[PDB]
Structure formats: C-alpha cells, structure tokens
Ligand SMILES: *[C@@H]1O[C@H](CO)[C@@H](O)[C@H](O)[C@H]1NC(C)=O
Ligand SMILES: *[C@@H]1O[C@H](CO)[C@@H](O)[C@H](O)[C@H]1NC(C)=O
Ligand SMILES: *[C@@H]1O[C@H](CO)[C@@H](O)[C@H](O)[C@H]1NC(C)=O
Ligand SMILES: *[C@@H]1O[C@H](CO)[C@@H](O)[C@H](O)[C@H]1NC(C)=O
Ligand SMILES: N[C@@H](Cc1ccccc1)C(=O)O
Ligand SMILES: N[C@@H](Cc1ccccc1)C(=O)O
Ligand SMILES: N[C@@H](Cc1ccccc1)C(=O)O
Ligand SMILES: N[C@@H](Cc1ccccc1)C(=O)O
Ligand SMILES: [Ca+2]
Ligand SMILES: [Ca+2]
C-alpha cells in the first residue's frame with residue numbers, strides 16, 4: 001500500500017528539515033552520568049532491529065518501517081565489531097566480557113581475558129577482568145541484573161562472573177577436577193563474587209540442592225534443584241544481607257519492589273530460562289518491562305546512582321529456533337523495556353546504551369509491499385515454483401525437504417508463532433552472525449558513542465561517563481541534578 | 482588463531498582509552514562544506530561491510546576483523562531506513578531518489594516523488610524531485626558522476642534523471658506511447674537535463690544509433706549502439722560544450738584528467754556495466770579508484786567546489802549472483818576509492834558520506850576461527866552431514882540439489898571467484914534486503930549524521946552542509962579555507 005501523505009515531497013522535506021533541526025540541537029554534556037544502563041538484545045542485529053520495527057509498527061496502527069522503535073529515538077549510534085579473540089562469529093559469554101568488562105575474550109568464556117582457555121579451569125586465575133557493574137558497586141552505586149534468561153546465563157554472568165566455561169551453571173555441570181581447582185559454578189559466583197542489589201530472571205534450579213522441588217513445578221522433577229553440594233544459594237544470599245528478599249513469582253516481585261525495607265531483591269521466575277513473552281503466564285511471571293521497573297524502583301533509591309543491565313535474552317533463542325516470530329516478539333518486549341526505563345530515568349543523569357552482543361543469519365528480503373506482514377510470503381514464486389518467505393535464515397532447523405523438494409509455504413503457515421523460516425543449511429540451531437551490530441546511546445557522554453568501534457567501547461564509555469575506574473580522573477562535572 | 486597481543490587486557494584497555502580520547506576530540510564545524518561527496522555502495526549492507534572488512538584485512542597482513550576499512554574511520558555513523566514508499570525491500574532507483582533528491586519514491590522509479598507510478602509515463606510530470614547534485618550545479622559547483630555500472634543505471638541516474646522506469650536506458654527501451662508522451666530515455670536525460678562536468682562509468686551502447694559498432698568490441702554486434710532515433714548522444718553532448726572530451730578507455734581518461742583545457746569529461750568504458758574488478762582489463766579500463774581520481778582532478782579546479790557521486794555499483798551485482806567473492810571484492814575497491822578521495826580532498830571543507838542504497842540477504846555465520854577465510858567452510862558438518870559455508874544467502878541462485886540432496890562443498894570450491902553460496906530458496910537472482918544500512922560521514926556538518934534516520938536525510942544533510950536549496954539560509958560560516 002502507498003500511504004498518500006508520502007506521495008508529496010513536502011512530507012519528506014518537512015521530516016528531513018525536522019531531523020536536521022534535531023540534529024543541530026544535540027549538544028554534548030559536560031557532566032558525568034549518575035546512573036548507567038545497558039540494554040542488551042541478545043542476538044539483536046541490524047536485520048532484527050528493522051524487522052522488529054516493522055512488526056511493532058504494524059502491531060500499532062501502522063504500515064511498519066516508518067514507526068520508530070524506542071531504541072531508534074536514541075541520538076547516538078555507532079557500529080560495534082563483535083568478533084571474539086578466537087572466533088569471527090562470537091558467542092554471548094565472550095561478547096559479554098567485551099561490552100561489560102571492556103576486554104575481548106575467547107568464545108564461551110565469561111569475564112576473562114583471552115589468555116584464558118575455554119573449559120580449562122587452570123587458565124582462569126590472573127585473567128579475571130572486572131565488569132563495570134562491579135566497579136559501579138565499588139563506587140557505592142546500587143547494581144542490578146535483569147534478564148529473561150537464567151540469571152546465570154552468559155550475558156548476565158558477564159556482569160559478575162569469571163569462568164572458562166559458560167556451561168557451568170551449577171556445580172552439577174563442573175567437572176570434579178575443576179571443582180577441586182576452585183572454579184565456582186556461575187550460580188555460586190552470582191551470590192559470592194560481588195554484592196548485587198537486584199537480580200531478576202530465570203535460573204531457580206541452579207540455586208538448590210538436587211531433590212528440591214521447584215515451587216512452580218513441584219510435580220516435574222526435571223525442574224528441581226540441580227546442586228550436588230547440598231547448598232541452598234538463595235538462603236545463603238539472603239543470610240548475608242538485612243532487607244534481602246527472594247521471590248519466584250510476579251506478585252511477590254511487585255510487592256517487594258514497593259517495599260521500602262527491601263534493599264536487595266532476588267527474583268528467579270523459572271527453573272531455567274523464562275518463557276517467551278508469547279508463552280508467559282502473566283499471573284505468575286513478570287515481563288521484561290515489569291522486571292526492569294521493579295529493578296529501577298529499588299536501584300533508584302541510592303543517592304549515588306545505579307548500574308543496571310537489562311537483557312532481551314531470548315531474542316537470540318527465537319533466532320536459534322529459526323522462529324522469527326519468537327525472535328521479533330522478544331525484540332519488541334525488549335524495546336518496550338527500553339522505553340519504560342526511559343520513562344523512569346532522566347537522560348540528564350543517566351547514560352543508557354542499547355546494543356546487541358552479536359547478530360544472527362537472519363535476513364529480510366523478497367520484495368514485499370509496504371504494510372505487508374513481516375511473517376508473510378515474498379511476492380512471486382521461487383525457481384522451484386513454490387512460495388517463499390520474506391524472512392529467511394542462512395542456516396538452521398527450518399531447512400526442510402518433503403519428498404525430495406523444498407516445501408511450499410502458505411501465509412497461514414508462515415504467520416504461525418511456531419513457524420520455522422527456511423534456511424540454506426539444516427542445523428539443529430541456527431547460528432549467530434558476525435556482522436557489526438548497532439549501539440544506540442543517550443545521556444551524559446552518549447555523544448562519545450560514535451563511528452565504528454570495538455565492542456569493548458561499550459564498557460569503557462560507561463565507566464568513563466560515571467567516572468569509574470579506570471577513568472576516575474574523567475574530566476567531568478558532577479551529574480546534572 | 483588467537484593473536485597473542487589480544488590476550489592481555491591492556492591491549493583492549495589501551496585501544497578503548499585511545500578511542501575515548503578520539504571521541505572526546507570530535508568537534509562540530511561552524512563552517513559550510515565547499516565540496517560534497519557521496520560514496521554509494523550499491524547493496525552494501527552491514528553484513529557486506531563486515532565481511533569486506535575481514536577480507537580486506539586478510540588481503541593485507543592481517544587476521545581481518547580488527548583492521549578498519551577506510552569507511553570505518555569516518556567519525557559519524559547513523560542507520561538509514563531504506564524502505565521505498567511502496568515496498569519494504571527497495572530497489573536502487575527509488576532509494577536513489579531518497580539519498581540523492583531527499584524524497585522517498587516508488588520502487589523502480591528515479592527522481593520522482595511517490596505520486597508517480599512505475600512504468601506510467603503520464604504520471605511523471607509535476608513529480609520530478611531535483612537532486613542535490615542538480616542544486617550544487619545551480620549554485621555554480623562542478624558536478625561529477627562516477628560508477629562501475631552503466632552511467633544510466635538506477636543509482637547514478639538519481640543524480641540527474643526523472644523517470645517512471647529505471648529500465649528505460651535508451652529509446653529502444655521506451656514504449657512508443659511513452660516516447661510520444663515525452664518520457665526521455667535515461668541516456669538522453671544524462672546529456673540533456675543538466676550540465677554534468679564529469680561522467681564516468683559504463684553504458685556506451687545507449688548513446689549510439691543501432692548499428693554503431695562498439696569501439697572496444699567491434700566484432701560483437703550485441704555490444705553495439707541501441708538507439709532507434711539515429712542520435713549520437715556523445716556527439717550532441719560534446720557539441721554543447723567547449724573543452725568537452727569523450728573517452729572510452731583508461732589511457733585517454735588519464736590523459737584527459739591531466740589536460741587543463743578539458744572542462745567536461747565523459748568516459749564510457751564498456752557497452753553496459755563495467756567489468757567486475759577481478760575481470761577488469763587494466764590496460765583498457767580504469768578502476769573505480771582511478772575514475773574517482775580522474776573526476777577529482779577536474780572537479781577540484783572550480784573555486785566554488787564540487788559535488789561528486791561515486792558508486793561501488795557492482796557490489797550489488799555480486800550479491801545478486803550469490804557470488805560473495807564478487808560482492809566483497811567490489812566492496813574493497815569501493816572502499817579503496819573512498820580512501821583515495823580522502824587523500825585528494827580535505828575534511829575541513831569536504832563533506833563525505835558513505836552509504837548503501839539497501840542491503841542483501843547475505844549472512845556471515847557458522848563459527849569460523851579468527852583469521853579464517855571469509856570464503857571458507859563453517860566448522861562442523863550440517864545436520865545432513867555435509868559441509869557448509871560461513872557465507873550464505875537467504876535466497877538466490879546458489880540453491881542446489883544434486884540427486885535430491887544439498888551438495889557438499891569443499892574449501893577449494895567455496896573459495897572460487899565463481900562460487901555461488903547456497904541459499905534457502907532458489908531464485909535466478911538473490912534479492913535485496915530491507916534492513917537498515919549504515920551511513921558514515923566526515924567533514925563539515927558530518928556530525929548531523931546521527932541516530933536512525935530516513936534515507937532521505939543523506940540528501941538533506943548534504944544540501945544543508947553546502948547551503949544549497951532549500952537550506953540557503955543554512956546558518957553557516959564560509960567553508961574553512
Ligand atoms: C591445565 O590442565 C591440563 C590437564 O591436566 C594440563 O594439560 C595443562 O598443563 C594445565 N595448564 C596449566 C596452565 O596449568
Ligand atoms: C508467590 O509466591 C509466594 C511464596 O513466596 C506464595 O505464597 C504465593 O502463593 C505465590 N503466588 C502464586 C500465584 O503461586
Ligand atoms: C496513464 O495512461 C493510462 C493508459 O492509457 C491510463 O489508464 C491512465 O488514466 C493515465 N493516467 C493519467 C494520470 O493520465
Ligand atoms: C583509446 O582510445 C583512443 C580513441 O579515442 C584510441 O586512439 C586508442 O587506441 C585507445 N586505446 C586502446 C588501447 O584501444
Ligand atoms: N547462544 C546460543 C547458541 C550458542 C552459544 C555459544 C556457542 C554456540 C552456540 C544459545 O545458548 O542459546
Ligand atoms: N506492570 C507492572 C508489574 C510489576 C511491577 C513491578 C514488579 C513486578 C511487577 C510493572 O511494570 O511494574
Ligand atoms: N538491482 C538489481 C536487481 C533488482 C532491481 C530492482 C528490482 C528488482 C531487482 C539489478 O538490477 O542488478
Ligand atoms: N592509477 C591512476 C590511473 C588513472 C588516473 C586518472 C585517470 C585515469 C586513470 C589513478 O588513480 O588516477
Ligand atoms: Ca514462573
Ligand atoms: Ca572497456
């Protein structure tokens with residue numbers, strides 16, 4: 001469909017003149033950031049952003065691509081080079097080292113320099129690189145980790161953990177030799193490495209001893225505690241702090257977030273990862289946006305400010321499944337959380353960055369008409385005389401042959417939340433992609449986020465903005481306010 | 482391979498500290514641009530940039546992804562939304578309207594608002610939108626069009642032409658009803674719409690009457706003139722201007738570019754598109770970089786400045802073929818032309834933008850090791866127990882089944898300049914992609930290129946920077962110098 005307003009050049013000329021006006025009004029701050037927020041869309045590459053924008057646009061009144069995402073409104077954009085030291089196409093652990101600790105690492109390690117080696121516990125020590133969240137805490141800020149994955153998953157773990165193996169969620173996962181060598185499982189590291197004021201996401205099971213029924217699924221033994229060492233890490237965490245609260249459901253979370261006596265909050269909402277938003281039980285489980293608000297309620301009390309990590313963690317998971325519907329709906333909820341955090345904080349004193357750890361082999365093509373569903377069919381048949389979707393994957397589990405042939409696909413099929421877009425190469429999981437991802441920034445010193453930068457720049461600009469180590473001699477005036 | 486230097490956090494911390502230093506040193510100009518250059522990588526989306534960076538890096542001493550492209554050094558980056566008014570995934574003609582005229586258009590039209598309709602000549606008039614190049618000429622600047630495509634191809638045509646059908650290269654292509662209605666073929670528009678000081682690229686055949694042997698291929702009748710109206714447009718163009726020169730080969734081009742009496746230069750180096758760089762005859766044909774230098778030699782003489790359009794036009798063509806080797810080698814040469822133009826001009830008075838018209842369904846995945854060839858195999862077999870490449874396409878002509886099965890692929894095969902990467906969906910040509918593309922900017926007012934913008938912003942910032950209509954009341958001081 002051609003929107004009539006857009007047929008007049010004046011429409012475009014007015015928009016551009018307004019854009020030039022806004023561009024000209026941008027001024028760099030002379031002042032530091034009181035607060036830091038990093039919003040991490042796991043797997044949210046450029047193609048994901050555009051596709052999500054179109055989907056979000058259409059979910060409102062709109063044709064799609066002309067409607068800004070909340071992230072699109074951020075004034076400063078850079079490209080971020082995501083390669084890990086050892087792999088061009090990276091994983092979440094080693095990218096987390098980059099954007100949270102400011103140093104690049106090796107694939108499937110977390111919080112370690114690239115002197116360490118995956119799955120070799122004895123290469124850990126001396127290679128620990130401290131996150132900006134950790135430095136924020138040291139400087140007296142409150143700190144929070146919020147994600148739709150396990151809070152022990154690679155991205156959130158980057159804020160607090162140092163491990164040669166991102167798969168070491170609980171002690172059950174750690175080989176005996178590594179346990180003897182003192183490489184702590186991530187769940188332990190979560191409660192032990194540093195004080196974290198707010199921890200919200202999945203990963204209940206890693207905190208409890210084998211045999212402990214999950215509070216939510218007490219009749220599914222597979223969801224129970226995993227720990228071999230008999231520890232209840234939740235109780236240990238609570239015991240260390242007056243005003244600490246543990247919650248496992250939404251209503252308790254909301255209650256805790258409004259309770260002035262709650263100074264530390266651990267909310268673990270599923271045994272493993274949280275459900276996709278489309279599957280979320282809204283009585284039992286908070287959305288990402290809700291977890292972010294709950295976090296901000298607590299974190300905002302500290303006069304020294306806060307550092308908050310918010311992850312749209314299952315964007316990534318949707319793409320691995322080659323289910324763009326899941327990737328893109330997770331992206332929208334991620335963007336909704338960005339929007340919500342922007343309502344609850346001030347860009348005068350809050351530096352907010354939105355980025356992705358890496359992308360995926362997700363493409364948006366064919367030549368679909370304006371306003372057509374992102375989950376629809378490309379116009380025109382393929383050379384094998386069957387239909388194809390506008391969304392495709394380079395590889396992944398959407399690759400199919402029914403009786404020697406690529407299957408035809410209908411619109412009703414392609415639009416299903418379970419539909420797997422086709423790919424060139426069958427893999428159980430679609431792969432990450434290595435192309436640059438966007439960094440969006442607003443707030444004090446956001447203007448430093450520019451050009452094409454290494455992914456480590458994300459961590460460094462945040463430290464610098466808040467005058468955290470190694471930039472305590474930042475040359476900045478106190479935060480506005 | 483893990484580079485040892487990168488195992489030390491200090492490496493990353495030093496780089497980031499240097500990046501922060503450079504970021505802090507950026508200051509906006511108070512002064513106008515004397516000169517404007519737009520470098521257009523046709524089809525050069527984010528995945529293409531990263532893949533080309535890696536390839537370029539490796540062509541030098543290097544592992545790849547850590548080595549900046551010339552474009553990567555530009556200080557200001559924005560994302561550009563490429564949708565056409567009528568299609569989410571755009572073409573080159575209507576995007577050219579956006580980034581060259583500052584108004585979005587309908588798929589496969591050029592230089593027309595979206596009130597016009599593809600292939601309907603009678604919707605043309607009143608919908609012409611004037612390019613910034615045209616406005617630059619009006620303001621007394623010299624202007625140049627340089628591309629590896631036909632100079633009548635959609636992108637360069639955006640600088641001078643207005644047509645409802647980008648396929649109307651010569652009168653041979655224009656239906657009789659359109660010819661009667663006065664819709665001029667693009668080759669005619671090239672010599673007639675405006676004065677263009679430098680025109681360099683392909684497209685000889687459209688300028689000459691049917692039966693005119695091509696100077697380079699006088700024994701291949703398919704390469705001869707196409708025109709039905711008996712006109713020699715080259716002679717007509719030459720006749721209009723004292724100091725005008727026509728050349729069809731590299732040595733004459735170089736000679737003309739150094740000749741002070743040559744004020745207007747038309748260099749048409751192939752009958753249609755120029756050869757891929759890997760196929761270029763370096764005795765007969767200038768590279769993109771050479772054409773850009775030749776252009777700058779002439780354009781730079783004007784004390785009022787110049788507008789120059791430089792297109793890496795066959796990046797796009799490589800992706801359509803699903804031959805990433807061709808896409809990426811064209812990208813490197815494009816980047817080499819950017820680098821060369823940066824040597825020959827000053828960022829104190831030259832606003833240079835690098836962008837793409839749109840992307841492609843090109844992906845860079847698997848989990849290849851650092852330093853591995855971008856054209857190599859992903860580690861690990863696919864689920865059908867055969868190898869697969871790190872580079873894939875969502876759709877296109879690399880889709881194959883040999884005896885009911887996806888073919889296996891070897892490294893020697895995947896590395897060939899003729900290799901077609903596999904795709905999910907067989908199409909004779911791989912499709913464009915609709916995701917945002919990068920805009921890189923440097924020079925006066927380049928700091929206005931920020932955030933996520935409509936693709937029309939490219940044209941408007943350039944007009945504004947040089948105080949061209951509609952921004953003659955730009956509020957800017959004269960160009961530095
Ligand atoms: C780590 O342990 C492995 C297995 O015993 C051994 O081969 C290697 O030498 C150790 N590396 C270090 C740094 O001690
Ligand atoms: C939320 O958790 C508390 C236990 O902390 C429990 O008393 C309440 O029943 C829970 N809500 C639901 C709906 O299970
Ligand atoms: C363009 O010509 C077509 C074919 O005759 C006709 O259907 C249509 O009305 C014309 N449109 C305009 C704007 O005159
Ligand atoms: C280049 O063109 C001129 C004609 O303009 C011709 O005299 C010369 O032979 C040409 N060079 C080659 C190598 O064909
Ligand atoms: N990050 C993905 C897949 C992956 C990660 C790391 C290495 C390889 C694959 C998953 O855990 O959901
Ligand atoms: N809709 C609420 C629900 C909620 C809040 C806080 C905590 C838990 C739940 C939110 O945005 O805040
Ligand atoms: N731009 C491509 C293919 C294309 C353009 C426009 C529409 C559809 C396809 C080609 O001409 O090389
Ligand atoms: N290598 C030269 C060749 C050349 C120059 C000018 C014109 C034509 C050819 C270039 O960069 O300039
Ligand atoms: Ca739950
Ligand atoms: Ca030639």
Ligand SMILES: [Mg+2]
Nearest residue numbers: 042092155313
């Ligand atoms: Mg993650």
Ligand SMILES: [Mg+2]
Nearest residue numbers: 523573636794
């Ligand atoms: Mg082009």
Ligand SMILES: [Zn+2]
Nearest residue numbers: 042043092357
């Ligand atoms: Zn990830």
Ligand SMILES: [Zn+2]
Nearest residue numbers: 043316320432
């Ligand atoms: Zn992943």
Ligand SMILES: [Zn+2]
Nearest residue numbers: 523524573838
């Ligand atoms: Zn194009």
Ligand SMILES: [Zn+2]
Nearest residue numbers: 524797801913
């Ligand atoms: Zn194309």
